[PDB]
Each structure stands twice: as C-alpha cells, then as structure tokens.
Amino acid sequence: MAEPLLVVGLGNPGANYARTRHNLGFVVADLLAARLGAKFKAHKRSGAEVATGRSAGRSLVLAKPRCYMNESGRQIGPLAKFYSVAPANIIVIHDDLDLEFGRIRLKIGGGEGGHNGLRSVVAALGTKDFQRVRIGIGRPPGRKDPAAFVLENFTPAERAEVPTICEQAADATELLIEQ
C-alpha cells in the first residue's frame, strides 16, 4: 500500500516520567525508531516529534507528542493531517490497565480503558477507529488511585520484565504493520 502509516507512542514529558507505567508507548516508539535507525525530530506543524522509516515495505511515521498525556490528541490530529493519514492507518501504543502485566493485545476501535491519552486521541480524531497496541500493566493496587498508579515507576520485580515486554510490543507492532 502507498498510504502512510502513523505509529504513535503515548507518554508524559520529562525524566520524571520516562520510566513510569504510563510511558510504555514512548519506550516502544523509541525501540521501533532505534530498530529502523530513525531519529526523532521536532515537527512544528503539530508540536510532536517525528521519526521516519520503512517497515514491511510500508512508509512509516513514528511519533511521540511533546505535551502532557491529557493533551496528546491536539498534537496527533494535526500530525495525521500533515501526512494525510486516515485514522484507520494510525496505530497508537499504550499501557493498558485492563490487561495483565505483560500481556500484549491488538485492537481497532473499542473503549479507552480509562486511559486519558486515548481519550484525548479519540476526541482529536473524531473517532475511536484507530489501531491500538495494548500493553498490559495490570490493575492498580486497591491502596492507590489509578492515576497515581500509572505515574509510578514499575516495581523492581516488574522492572526485570519490562525490557522483554517492550521488545515483544515492538514486535507486535511490526507484525501489525506487515499484516
């Protein structure tokens, strides 16, 4: 297909949030960019940063909003317009509370799972019909509010597994791109 594909990883800006649960999308987007030797650059027409390349013979545009998670959509929308990418050809990688820690699933449309970033994207795109690479982080402990949970770094136990989980998520994204 000649149509461009837009892979978006979701996450908050700053070192304080780089290793948090809510930033898995950013981690996978970097992995993907590293894999195809592409480097992220400022995109002033959207405000996000972009990295370009090719996968499975397809034109690929990787992106990470530079604003806060709750405002992700306002950067992704203008980004899709710039590359004329239809919502359906947009793939967003995100952490998911409704899936067990480490479980990766694919899906087009459906709910936001309580993710404030997805909520933002759906609003900006005017639809829920965009692809998603869901990366399970598990339900939050009863002692913590869900918003606080996603803004914490993974436990030492989980941390040991995060690296392979991201490789798997990056792999699932590539397979998705191919099929």
UniProtKB/Swiss-Prot annotation:
Question: Which parts of the sequence are marked as the site Stabilizes the basic form of H active site to accept a proton?
Answer: 95
- Annotated compartments: Cytoplasm
Q: What EC number(s) is this enzyme filed under?
A: 3.1.1.29
Consequence of gene loss (knockout): Essential, it cannot be deleted. Depletion experiments lead to decreased growth. Depletion experiments lead to accumulation of peptidyl tRNAs, in particular all 3 peptidyl-prolyl-tRNA(Pro)s, a reduction in usable aminoacyl tRNA pools and hypersensitivity to macrolide antibiotics that target the 50S subunit.
Q: What is its biotechnological use? A: Might be a good antibiotic target especially in combination with antibiotics that targets 50S ribosmal subunits (macrolides) or target peptidyl tRNA drop off (lincosamide clindamycin and aminonucleoside puromycin).
InterPro entries according to UniProt: Pept_tRNA_hydro, Pept_tRNA_hydro_CS, Pept_tRNA_hydro_sf
Q: Which Pfam families match?
A: Pept_tRNA_hydro (PF01195)
Kind of enzyme, top EC level?
hydrolase
Name any Gene Ontology BP term: rescue of stalled ribosome
Any idea what job this protein has? Answer: Hydrolyzes ribosome-free peptidyl-tRNAs (with 1 or more amino acids incorporated), which drop off the ribosome during protein synthesis, or as a result of ribosome stalling. Catalyzes the release of premature peptidyl moieties from peptidyl-tRNA molecules trapped in stalled 50S ribosomal subunits, and thus maintains levels of free tRNAs and 50S ribosomes.
Q: Which family does it belong to?
A: Belongs to the PTH family.
Which protein, by its recorded name, is this?
Peptidyl-tRNA hydrolase
What gene is this protein translated from? Answer: pth
